[PDB]
């Protein structure tokens, strides 16, 4: 191995009269071409597989002599004016300041205080647990002599004494609701890394359903008449769209007459993509909802941007206290149609009368004006 | 209030032993083994073709060798006063056979 000579290789007094070009050898035969090295022609295999078994007209050099350096517009610069692979705090992946002592690992923005990646304390960093381990020596008598003293010095809040005490010995932890509150709402469900999901989120598709589907399958229900199976699978009947009131599939000899149809994720009502104006099947993200369902957020302007949300579904804690019906009985919006988060039970005729008198007494009020 | 009919652990294992010592059909699925054979051969020569008979011969030889190896492995496992075969048993069988160094 010849030494990496400094090319200039000055001879007498820095005259650099003699040079020594570096040996290339490498950066050559590099085999980084998307094929074989750039200085070599196509391989015999590629040849066999691939083969099939006027410079005077170049008006390119005449470009520098017709390109005019252009400087208009502002142009003044407008001068002026071993170690864990998941974060032990949030249980996710990323860059980590692995502890020299503890096997646990944290993000840089999950520690306490958060630490800037470029402004690390460097040297050796200990987690709260190992700091406490070395501060306590793991024996119980000294820990007692320390913690009882802490409690004594915190008599003003002795009621909270040990809660205050135990914080110091705990590493930072991402906040997550305990299960005894999420369970109150059966609809909700945690995600893969805490992506807190609801009933409105579509079940994720697998790689088999996206990356392996052949030409004409998956999101590819846009490339062929192949998915003519917009026929009701369970019954074998035709999925009829709610608006046009017909199913369009044309023929294999007239695929241009077919119209895409989709079934709502919530209530399996078929809709034409061209009837509910849409450009694609969902297949991803959230669950599609017809334009035929009742609103959840009812943003109202009377600005008076008063919000109305439908109470989240409660565990079967849920109450349905029966009305005596007729007008009044102002529920917020919650209803359970029947033949403290109390889902009111409005039956059928009450709605009729309530709408009837709403619109009529409003028209008489308009008369009042 | 009824309980299903769960066979005691080790019963269905013995039934399977009897069934598979009684029969002769190949136990490894054919397509996965063919794919494995081609993948292994890809490291010795590219664009190789295999006679179906060649793949079948390889499968028969491999299955016979594995069955004999498992017989020896079971013998070693029993020698250690065990009933379960463990990787150390296979290693000892191969070492005594002279296959593994």
């Amino acid at each position: 191995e010849e030494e990496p000579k400094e090319l200039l290789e000055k001879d007498s007094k820095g005259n650099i009269i003699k040079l020594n070009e570096p040996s290339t050898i490498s950066e050559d035969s590099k085999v980084s071409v998307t094929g074989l090295p750039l200085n070599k022609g196509p391989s015999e295999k590629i040849k066999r597989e691939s083969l099939w078994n006027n410079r005077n007209d170049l008006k390119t050099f005449l470009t520098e002599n017709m390109t005019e350096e252009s400087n208009i517009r502002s142009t003044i610069g407008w001068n002026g004016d071993e170690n864990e692979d998941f974060c032990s705090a949030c249980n996710q992946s990323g860059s980590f300041l692995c502890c020299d002592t503890c096997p646990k690992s944290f993000h840089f923005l999950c520690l306490d205080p958060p630490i800037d990646p470029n402004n690390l304390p460097k040297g050796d960093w200990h987690c709260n647990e190992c700091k406490f381990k070395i501060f306590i020596n793991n024996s119980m008598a000294t820990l007692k002599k320390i913690e009882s003293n802490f409690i004594k010095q915190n008599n003003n809040v002795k009621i909270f004494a040990k809660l205050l005490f135990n914080i110091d010995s705990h590493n930072p932890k991402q906040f997550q609701l305990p299960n005894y509150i999420k369970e109150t709402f059966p609809a909700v469900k945690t995600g893969s890394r805490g992506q807190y999901s609801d009933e409105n989120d579509k079940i994720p598709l697998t790689d088999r359903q996206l990356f392996n589907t052949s030409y004409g399958q998956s999101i590819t229900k846009l490339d062929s008449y192949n998915p003519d199976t917009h026929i009701d699978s369970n019954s074998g009947k035709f999925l009829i769209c709610y608006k046009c009131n017909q199913t369009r599939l044309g023929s294999w000899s007239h695929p241009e007459n077919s119209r895409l149809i989709m079934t709502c994720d919530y209530c399996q009502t078929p809709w034409h993509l061209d009837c509910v104006p849409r450009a694609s099947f969902k297949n991803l993200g959230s669950k599609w909802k017809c334009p035929l369902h009742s609103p959840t957020k009812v943003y109202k302007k009377i600005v008076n941007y008063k919000v109305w949300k439908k109470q989240r579904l409660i565990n079967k804690n849920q109450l349905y206290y029966e009305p005596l019906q007729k007008i009044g009985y102002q529920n917020n919006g919650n209803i359970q149609i029947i033949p403290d988060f109390k889902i009111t039970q409005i039956d059928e005729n009450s709605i009729k009368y309530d709408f009837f008198d709403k619109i009529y007494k409003s028209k008489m009020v308009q008369k009042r004006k | 209030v009824k309980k299903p009919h769960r066979y005691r652990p080790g019963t269905v294992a013995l039934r399977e032993i009897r069934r598979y010592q009684k029969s002769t059909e190949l136990l490894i699925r054919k397509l996965p083994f063919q794919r494995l054979v081609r993948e292994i051969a890809q490291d010795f020569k590219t664009d190789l073709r295999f006679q179906s008979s060649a793949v079948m011969a390889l499968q028969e030889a491999s299955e016979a060798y594995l069955v004999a190896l498992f017989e020896d492995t079971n013998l070693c496992a029993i020698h250690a006063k065990r009933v379960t075969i463990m990787p150390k048993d296979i290693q000892l069988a191969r070492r005594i056979r002279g296959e593994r160094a």
């Binding site: 004409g216 003519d228 017909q246 | -």
Partner: protein, 77 residues
């Protein structure tokens, strides 16, 4: 590979023909047009439709080509 690359609806063809050119699909299309008419019978005029396909043959002299192809196949089978 060039002209093949631009052959989207033709590379899947020859497999979609096998599926969609069959008895089941052929009755399915006609039955569906009939169902659409009967749905605009449930929700639109009841009596009117007396057909569901309108196959047209503007050009003669194609029948003879179909017959020639059939004859060739017959002679080959």
């Amino acid at each position: 590979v060039f002209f093949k690359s631009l052959d989207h609806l033709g590379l899947t063809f020859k497999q979609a023909d096998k599926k969609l050119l069959t008895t089941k699909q052929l009755i399915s299309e006609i039955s569906s047009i009939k169902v659409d008419q009967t749905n605009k019978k449930i929700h639109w005029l009841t009596p009117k439709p007396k057909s569901q396909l309108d196959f047209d043959f503007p050009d003669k002299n194609i029948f003879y080509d179909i017959l020639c192809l059939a004859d060739t196949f017959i002679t080959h089978t």
